[PDB]
Amino acid sequence: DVSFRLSGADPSSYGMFIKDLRNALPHTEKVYNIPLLLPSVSGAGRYLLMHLFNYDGNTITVAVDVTNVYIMGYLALTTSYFFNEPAADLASQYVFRSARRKITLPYSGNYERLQIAAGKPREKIPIGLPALDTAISTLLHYDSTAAAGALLVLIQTTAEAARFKYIEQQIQERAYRDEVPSSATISLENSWSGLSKQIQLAQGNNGVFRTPTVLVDSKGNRVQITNVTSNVVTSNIQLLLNTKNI
Numbered sequence: 001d002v003s004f005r006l007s008g009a010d011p012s013s014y015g016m017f018i019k020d021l022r023n024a025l026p027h028t029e030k031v032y033n034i035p036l037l038l039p040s041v042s043g044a045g046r047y048l049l050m051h052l053f054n055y056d057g058n059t060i061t062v063a064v065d066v067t068n069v070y071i072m073g074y075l076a077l078t079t080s081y082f083f084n085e086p087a088a089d090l091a092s093q094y095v096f097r098s099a100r101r102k103i104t105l106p107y108s109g110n111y112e113r114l115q116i117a118a119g120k121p122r123e124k125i126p127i128g129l130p131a132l133d134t135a136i137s138t139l140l141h142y143d144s145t146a147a148a149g150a151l152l153v154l155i156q157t158t159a160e161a162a163r164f165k166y167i168e169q170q171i172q173e174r175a176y177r178d179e180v181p182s183s184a185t186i187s188l189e190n191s192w193s194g195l196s197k198q199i200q201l202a203q204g205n206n207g208v209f210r211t212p213t214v215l216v217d218s219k220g221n222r223v224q225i226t227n228v229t230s231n232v233v234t235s236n237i238q239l240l241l242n243t244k245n246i
């Protein structure tokens with residue numbers, strides 16, 4: 001398991017949590033020095049538990065699929081909550097079984113569905129450590145509209161930050177003041193599958209992407225990533241979605 005406490009949190013302790021999160025994901029191989037997530041894992045070993053504590057010390061446990069860093073569901077006191085999607089129902093066979101009741105959320109976990117339920121795109125939702133504290137608090141008591149927004153915050157400040165060093169740094173900058181994600185942050189989130197694929201395809205193509213990936217950089221400028229010498233590959237991305245899952 002991995003843990004993070006918002007009480008006394010600072011950029012350093014958050015950095016340690018994201019490091020722990022990355023290190024908890026198993027891999028058998030690196031591709032261009034980036035850990036390659038496994039094609040599959042059987043049984044309960046598929047799911048990592050993240051223990052998150054809000055400023056007041058109240059806690060949720062979040063179940064994460066270690067093959068893709070997708071959040072499946074979470075436990076809040078004696079109630080479990082899972083996304084309305086087959087991967088999450090499968091996860092519900094293995095985690096939080098001791099919950100007194102299980103609620104299936106009225107949406108799947110993908111960004112589009114969550115944004116619909118929340119009533120806003122995540123371009124408009126501030127993120128940061130304060131937002132994460134709020135998210136944890138919201139998820140403690142069932143409110144499906146509120147929870148959609150909370151989950152958009154949770155996903156970005158945990159799994160997204162684990163996937164990209166740039167996103168981890170963006171959250172560290174927002175340790176004591178929330179701010180909506182940079183356009184670059186959004187671009188990277190949207191491009192993780194694509195980038196993971198092209199980095200793997202580059203292995204037998206001399207480091208060259210079969211299809212270029214278009215990203216927005218820090219300055220709001222749109223750019224093309226064509227090969228593994230790019231900063232996105234050498235410095236930024238920290239985990240690869242296995243091409244078998246793409």
Ligand SMILES: *[C@@H]1O[C@H](CO)[C@@H](O)[C@H](O)[C@H]1NC(C)=O
Nearest residue numbers: 208225226227228229230231
């Ligand atoms: C590869 O990408 C680098 C970094 O952006 C770029 O400067 C270069 O033009 C590209 N080289 C090849 C061979 O595609």
